[PDB]
Amino acid sequence: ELKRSIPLLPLRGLLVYPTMVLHLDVGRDKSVQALEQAMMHDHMIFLATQQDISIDEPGEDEIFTVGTYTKIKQMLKLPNGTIRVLVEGLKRAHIVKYNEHEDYTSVDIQLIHEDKDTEDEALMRTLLDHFDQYIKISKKISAETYAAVTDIEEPGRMADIVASHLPLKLKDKQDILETADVKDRLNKVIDFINNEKEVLEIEK
């Protein structure tokens, strides 16, 4: 099944699956044009993740070929010229023709099909069990960690140890190591925790 001339929206550091519903804040000129172009027609767009998160104008080489045929549900034009859109993934599809225009990129795609056994039911039971084991195990580990860190009397040592358990990029951990001053170190770690807390709430 073929869909011609679908406006392309390259995602950075984010992947949308069919049936997922989320808000997106769009700013790249060529991305807001793609949105605006879709709203002038059937409200459909093609979301495809960029491979290199640092590129601002990705060519076909820099986007994955398979992505998600998507529906714009609500679109809001912000003060600054940015757009806040609510989208819903519908179907997976693959780029089959790349129409790079001046204002935005457009793409021809072919919808991909799948598609409930009694095997499938077992596998789901297994998926849920392992997922639950993994949730249970994180909860258990992090608790033991909180209790260990609780009994630490030295500020410098508490800042280091708490930093070593947070999901921080290495360069951030290195920053902590490179912060000799204990008060400065504690502050940075507190701040890191806040970011990690805010990021969690963002992804939800």
Explain what you see.
It is classed as hydrolase. Keywords: coiled-coil, hydrolase, protease, stress response. It forms a monomeric assembly. This protein is of the alpha+beta class and 204 residues long. It has 2 domains: 1-112, Archaeosine Trna-guanine Transglycosylase, Chain: A, domain 4 (Roll), CATH 2.30.130; 116-203, Methane Monooxygenase Hydroxylase, Chain G, domain 1 (Up-down Bundle). It is built from 5 helices and 6 strands, in the order ββαββββαααα. A 5-stranded mixed β-barrel has the order 1-3-4-5-6. It is globular, with a radius of gyration of 22 Å. The two termini are 33 Å apart.
Radius of gyration: 22 Å
Query: Roughly how many Å apart are the termini?
Result: 33 Å
- By secondary-structure content and strand pairing, the structural class works out as alpha+beta
Whole-number total of structural domains: 2
Number of helical segments with 4 or more residues: 5
| CATH architectural arrangement of the largest domain | Roll
Number of strands: 6
The first-level CATH class name of the largest domain: Mainly Beta
User: Reading side by side through the largest sheet, how are the strands ordered?
Assistant: 1-3-4-5-6
Strand content: 25-35%
Give the topology string: H per helix, E per strand.
Answer: EEHEEEEHHHH
Shape assignment: globular
The H-level CATH homologous superfamily of the largest domain, spelled out, is: LON domain-like
Predict the CATH topology of the largest domain. Answer: Archaeosine Trna-guanine Transglycosylase, Chain: A, domain 4
Largest pleated sheet? 5 strands, mixed, barrel
Helix content, binned percent = 40-55%
PDB class: hydrolase
Keywords: coiled-coil, ATP-binding, hydrolase, nucleotide-binding, protease, serine protease, stress response
Assembly: monomeric
Entry title: Crystal structure of Bacillus subtilis Lon N-terminal domain
